[PDB]
Symmetry: D2
Subunit: 315 residues, 4 copies
Amino acid sequence: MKTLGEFIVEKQHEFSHATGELTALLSAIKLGAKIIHRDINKAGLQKLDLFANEKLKAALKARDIVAGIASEEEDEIVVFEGCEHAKYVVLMDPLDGSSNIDVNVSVGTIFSIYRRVTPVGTPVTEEDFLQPGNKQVAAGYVVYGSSTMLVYTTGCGVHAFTYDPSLGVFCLCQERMRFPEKGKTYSINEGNYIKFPNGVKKYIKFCQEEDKSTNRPYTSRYIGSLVADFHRNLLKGGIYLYPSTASHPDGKLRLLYECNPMAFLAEQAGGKASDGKERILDIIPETLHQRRSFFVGNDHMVEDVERFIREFPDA
Amino acid sequence: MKTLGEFIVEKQHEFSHATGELTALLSAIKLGAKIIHRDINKAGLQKLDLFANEKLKAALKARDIVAGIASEEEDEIVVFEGCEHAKYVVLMDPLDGSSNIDVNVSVGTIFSIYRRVTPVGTPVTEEDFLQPGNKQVAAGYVVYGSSTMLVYTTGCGVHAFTYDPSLGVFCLCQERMRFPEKGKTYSINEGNYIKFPNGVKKYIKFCQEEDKSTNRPYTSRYIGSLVADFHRNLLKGGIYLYPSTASHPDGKLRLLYECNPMAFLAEQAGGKASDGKERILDIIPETLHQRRSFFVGNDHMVEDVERFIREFPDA
Amino acid sequence: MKTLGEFIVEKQHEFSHATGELTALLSAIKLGAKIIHRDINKAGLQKLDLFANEKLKAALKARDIVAGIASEEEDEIVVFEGCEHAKYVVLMDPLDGSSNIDVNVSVGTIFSIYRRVTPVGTPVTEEDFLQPGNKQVAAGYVVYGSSTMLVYTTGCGVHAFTYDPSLGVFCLCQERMRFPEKGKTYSINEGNYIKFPNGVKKYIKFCQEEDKSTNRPYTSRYIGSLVADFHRNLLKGGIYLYPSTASHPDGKLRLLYECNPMAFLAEQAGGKASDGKERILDIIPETLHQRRSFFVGNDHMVEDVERFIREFPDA
Amino acid sequence: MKTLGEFIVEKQHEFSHATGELTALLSAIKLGAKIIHRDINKAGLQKLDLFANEKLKAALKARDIVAGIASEEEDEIVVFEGCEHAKYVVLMDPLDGSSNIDVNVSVGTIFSIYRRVTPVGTPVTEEDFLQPGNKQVAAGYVVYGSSTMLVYTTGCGVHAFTYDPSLGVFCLCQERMRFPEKGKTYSINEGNYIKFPNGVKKYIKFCQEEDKSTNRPYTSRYIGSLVADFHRNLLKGGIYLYPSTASHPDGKLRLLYECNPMAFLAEQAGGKASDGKERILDIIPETLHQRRSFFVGNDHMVEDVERFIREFPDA
Ligand SMILES: O=P(O)(O)OC[C@H]1O[C@](O)(CO)[C@@H](O)[C@@H]1O
Ligand SMILES: O=P(O)(O)OC[C@H]1O[C@](O)(CO)[C@@H](O)[C@@H]1O
Ligand SMILES: O=P(O)(O)OC[C@H]1O[C@](O)(CO)[C@@H](O)[C@@H]1O
Ligand SMILES: O=P(O)(O)OC[C@H]1O[C@](O)(CO)[C@@H](O)[C@@H]1O
């Protein structure tokens, strides 16, 4: 058995070799993950979003390693007083899958870590949080399901750890997660069908056609939690889609707090992350809460989606 | 706080007032639930189906309260040697949602309890397991999600309990679960679209139409675990569908191990359970592993499905 | 692995064959044990005595199996309203080893169960609680140490179970506990030396003499918790002593809440329990809070104590 | 609530301000503590000494922060291959209180940390482990009792943390532990009376005299585990004694693995640690497994012991 902290130490080559800092950063994350897990694993016994938000903020501030954070739950960025010396910033989706807490269905936490651009000693600015996904030095998520797992990458593969309640520690369970050769599952809220872009509706149809030669029709799975749907598709192969709709002209997901980190992860796993046309990681952010269409998963599936959008433009 | 065992004692009027027996029966179930939960909550650290199966069988035999069991994992019924005196039989789906174990997604256990028809002292026969759903004296499920819960009914409402890891006991969290007034979510594997009965495809379309007056289009949620999808729809309102397809001419779900218990539960919660035409609970079983189309959830939604099937017969 | 409840079922011959009742009784005890354990295992994170007291009382009342209880923490007996039909009474030392809670040292719970003498339907009276130890139908203790264990007897051996935090259940770990052939440890608060009866001081000296032929000098162990000292001496052999002193003319331990149950246990394990002269179990109680000198453990050691008291009377 | 790791960060002034290293060191310790706790909390469900030994060694090697270790269970010192660059060495008593594991009585782990004297890059030598107690830069213990706690010091007070099973993390419960103004408990194995040094026997007598003005006679407590007896005496006041006997001419405790660390702790808490004549921390070690008489606890009590030894020399 190998713990997360022991793995961090063992993989010196990652994170620009600043091993000491990576341990402090993830230590904050897992502590928050342990705390949130505790409240969630006893939910029965707009509320937990705030709790997760506060717990993660406080833990990150307590390691005196982060200069400030950006949260999907907050309007502005949060500058940690006394941490003007820190050189890292974190963006996070404290609790992804809000509609799943009360139903005892999987939810998760997403985090994205960037190295600040603004001078140390001084206070961080939106400038530090509006960097393109391709500049992240770290990203990952925590999934609170039948078991609680932490998954992350720094640019050298996707590593997964499982919390062992018997010990109270996270243990390595998979060192190099990779999408399988092909996918056969699509995850999308088909309820919003009529309002989907025409190219996406064509793709859906494609998925439902009978062609055993290509494993079609595909299987449909949609948990309602991006972290949970992503996790499954990475292990079993599949694609997750959330295009623009009536309610969300520019998609629903936040580009900075959700799209980029999951994109950095999908890619490090051999997958692909797109907004239907361009690479999510190369998009230049314009606002802190900018949303974006998201298509992530097996490369061939995302490509298919991209192709249908091409051949069938304008919803 | 009130435990499951203390609730059993307090609700003497239920289970034909044979309180002592109900406690032994559920004690077996929760023990199995605790054991399975342990292996599942540490899965990372066709396999668990067998483990759950053996654990539940052994626990039920150890209470010397059940005469024999029928399992979805077994070809024949299991007669408990030395229990020919027992007067109850149990049918069970040890682990529902096989495709979810490896992905850390919710799975569950389903159980159905009948009073034997064959004379005590003698060994139980399929006759005891081929009774119609409306004769069950008890039914329920265990859902292993962000938290582990046990849900059951004996004919007087649906009761839910949450496992408290801090104590190692199940506590009441909801004494009378009821479907809300209306539902706005449909759960079905849309991947199998083209092969669905024509009436179901029409219903799907119905669900996707824009009519704010009726909360349409509906939301789409499909976890892939019947227990998890059912649980959510009961708390939030919704319908779960699994019609006949190419792969499953008579639906996929087993009538005795899955349909009947969930049906007894849906009904006790104010919902409705149908195979598209008739009431699941009044169907006379023909074989031990008989499958059946299943439509369960809010009454108005099931009725809609029934109506479309009527107006659009033959797939 | 075998659980406590499964062991209860398997040993039908015990408890006058009223198996159903024994399960309800111990179920109350272990629930209280689980609850107390939870608060104790997080003490750091005259107070717990009250908490343990209330929790045990409530659990016993909730099984609707006990008519009333007598507690070392209470002045009077407690009559359970609505339980006038119950036919069992319980005496208990909710938290034995008060001076050990704050220091993270072992403490325990002791319980004694009698069948009532007064007519059912009517309310129990002190008469039901002032019966001699030899009439107990059940007795045992819970020890909260490095691990939490429940130990009990109904008159057919001493059975021990260990709480498995991984499962949240008590498992059999020893079905027939017996004192070893000989003991080599004495447990007494030697601080109260000068005030000990002369016969006891002689015995102490005896214990400290050099005579390898008899394993002397003996080892001295005194945890300060009767349950913890008893437990060790039963597994490893030894004697526990608490004679009369300046502060306690009639010993410190309560005859009904501490002496009798531990005596019933010592005896069932092949040991012996005395007040220095007579058998604890045959003493006729005079008051609810009557105290008594106590000498329990390996038979040969208790006999030695009895002999010195004889040869050296009057402190 | 504040975690151990967050406290480490907050107390930068300690450990020569090399905060990053202290976190890695204690991280190893607590991981070992979590692992051992797991096996101990399920002992029922010469053996654990070895298990604790291996687990602690491996954890320390995995942080790549220690150059080598000295264990009470090992004949020679252990040089960590690949860690010749490390600049810290650790001496440890993996499992203190061997005679307590099987009886579910408290046991603990003791550790002592020194900065190496030999050149980095090269392999550590006994020279690095034979330094006097006053050169330790860190010391502490883990006590596995009703709850599991970690206690340590670097020279600025004694800090205690309690493991929270609900979270799987150690939380601060006491930042500055100090012996109370006076003590009233003595901990010694009085079984070895006749062979004790004459001065110690006089002290024992002293402890048993009646003099309410000085809280005499004192209370006697002896758990059999040095870590557990020490812990209690520090919280409640008291003295722990283990003089030379027939079996142990130079006392039983090891000077390096037990005496020094506990001494560094006693002192940092306002107490005193002596071998009956000189200060334990200033003794120059001669051998790796050198034993020594030990008298630790409230300063006035140790002084009394020292005085009686003076006035009554030669056993
Ligand atoms: O309810 P909808 O429209 O399907 O949105 C679900 C999506 O929203 C989120 O809950 C929040 O971004 C995602 O986790 C999930 O994929
Ligand atoms: O993979 P499919 O065809 O969607 O089937 C999923 C269904 O099968 C089961 O896993 C087994 O009955 C159900 O729990 C679930 O609803
Ligand atoms: O503090 P003392 O006088 O040694 O008494 C300790 C005894 O008192 C109790 O704490 C209470 O009866 C026992 O558990 C223990 O054996
Ligand atoms: O069995 P004895 O001689 O009292 O020795 C007990 C002492 O030995 C140890 O178990 C080992 O050093 C200590 O923890 C304890 O204080």
